[PDB]
Amino acid sequence: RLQEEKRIEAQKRKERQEAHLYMQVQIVAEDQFCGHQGNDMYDEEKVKYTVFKVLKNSSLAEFVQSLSQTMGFPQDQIRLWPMQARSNGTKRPAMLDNEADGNKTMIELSDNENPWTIFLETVDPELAASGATLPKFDKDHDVMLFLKMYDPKTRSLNYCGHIYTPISCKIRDLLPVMCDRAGFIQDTSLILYEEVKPNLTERIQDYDVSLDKALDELMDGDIIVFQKDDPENDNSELPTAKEYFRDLYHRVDVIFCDKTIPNDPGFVVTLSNRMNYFQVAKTVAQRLNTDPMLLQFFKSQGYRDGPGNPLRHNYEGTLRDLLQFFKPRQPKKLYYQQLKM
């Protein structure tokens, strides 16, 4: 039974050779969207896929069959929304003809893209018994919107699912769904934003208009963030969804090392390129239970890895001006020392 080991290298090649024949279809299921705190639907590094080695010139009906089987669903009670990267640095689900663009080879539906990520829409697992089917979708008068709730109090995003809705329907007819899915009372006054892309978070002003108008460049996969219109958002440092998405686009992790501690491993803080000295000192101060006026920061020599000039506590710049001398790996870093009393 060692000759069963003439076949480990007979596929360590037979597969290395045929590899050009196959593509990697990376399925994502909607659950992987919960918790995600950034833009778009997930995070390619923290996302987890169900991977499919599928024949480049395979068929799509063949995939749905293989798919339905492997994951355990009815080849007719599910939907494939191929993930699609856009010119604005955003990857969102896009339509697919599950019957017309189904005469084609799998590789070309991918647009010669491998790997090929595809959002897998499944009927809810509860609604299953109910005789629930996955509702019909008119690829011309309906749209699929994804819903995120923003909580200023935690400054976190709570996924709220998706919805088939006709375009003609008006934003006002969507707010009840939002209150509901967010665990909110009905008629709770809400504020709404389309997440267009990083740093762009347009606020949706006129509710009583149809989506087709209410959303600039409406498309399947657009994203509406909503939040309570409550006065206690104003005690939050990022009171609106927009302010969160800004501070997140501007967000940057920085290492801090005590100059006096030799080979100080130091620690990481997450800061914002448009913070100023007070904001940085106040932050890093909290992270060590000591007064900010007790921290002496040093600029960056940018060449030697040792602290540069002492940073006067009246520094008129921003955190960015201090960090512009860094590159990739060079793990953006400054030096401090604790002061007496």
Partner: peptide, 6 residues
């Protein structure tokens, strides 16, 4: 009129 590109 829902679009096709961005």
């Amino acid at each position: 009129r829902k679009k096709k590109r961005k």
